[PDB]
């Protein structure tokens, strides 16, 4: 069985907050006028390093180790870009109109034009960040949503009964957080719904981002890491 289902809601929040990966920095040359190849190099180099921390974050998500290796692989392959994106969107809340890829890499929608077809995903990410900012999304809610993406995105492309049990546990955790913050019952499930509906758009952005990243592969603008290529290849 799983030790995650035995945790309390606050113990779940504390375990998730402690599992948080660090905010990594981009390569530090500030030739701010970017080219298509230079910014794509920066972003893919950032994604590769973040992927390594994401995998060790996934291990520390309560109930993720209980899964088999094959299932852990399938969930991360399906969710990795969603997980990167929600983190980016969460980092960009305090920076309206800009995307905080890294503390030394803060781009605006005008800088999204340096790459062919990137500005569309940039506006979607900015809109998601604006939506979190208007909802006053808390960090405790953010870590709950990020774990939900990890366990949910690949669950219906398959053991499965345990993932759903952990998902209910995180739902109980989200409601617990809103009850502590003073929200009424009606406000609780209304906010729960609003948060989870945003995950549908995050999936949308990921699918569009996966297409765009595949264009970079067969245009060979910049070499991609083997790990990033294997995560990208798992979406065919």
């Amino acid at each position: 069985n799983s030790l995650a289902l035995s945790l309390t809601a606050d113990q779940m929040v504390s375990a998730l907050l402690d599992a948080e990966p660090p905010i990594l920095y981009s390569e530090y040359d500030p030739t701010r006028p970017f080219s298509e190849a230079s910014m794509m190099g920066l972003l893919t180099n950032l994604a590769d390093r973040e992927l390594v921390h994401m995998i060790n974050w996934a291990k520390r998500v309560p109930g993720f180790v209980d899964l088999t290796l094959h299932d852990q692989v399938h969930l991360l392959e399906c969710a990795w870009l969603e997980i990167l994106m929600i983190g980016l969107v969460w980092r960009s809340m305090e920076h309206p109109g800009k995307l905080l890829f890294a503390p030394n890499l803060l781009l605006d929608r005008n800088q999204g034009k340096c790459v062919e077809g990137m500005v569309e995903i940039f506006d979607m990410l900015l809109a998601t960040s604006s939506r979190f900012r208007m909802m006053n999304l808390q960090g405790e809610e953010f870590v709950c949503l990020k774990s939900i993406i990890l366990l949910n995105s690949g669950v219906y492309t398959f053991e499965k009964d345990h993932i759903h049990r952990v998902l209910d546990k995180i739902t109980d955790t989200l409601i617990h957080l809103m009850a502590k913050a003073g929200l009424t019952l009606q406000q609780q499930h209304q906010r729960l719904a609003q948060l989870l509906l945003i995950l549908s758009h995050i999936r949308h952005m990921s699918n569009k981002g996966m297409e765009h990243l595949y264009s970079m592969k067969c245009k060979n603008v910049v070499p991609l890491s083997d790990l990033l290529l294997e995560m990208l290849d798992a979406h065919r």
């Binding site: 060790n56 996934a58 692989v73 392959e77 995560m231």
Partner: peptide, 10 residues
């Protein structure tokens, strides 16, 4: 052989 397999086991 996947890199993801290795990083998940280390």
């Amino acid at each position: 052989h996947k890199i993801l397999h290795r990083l998940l086991q280390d």
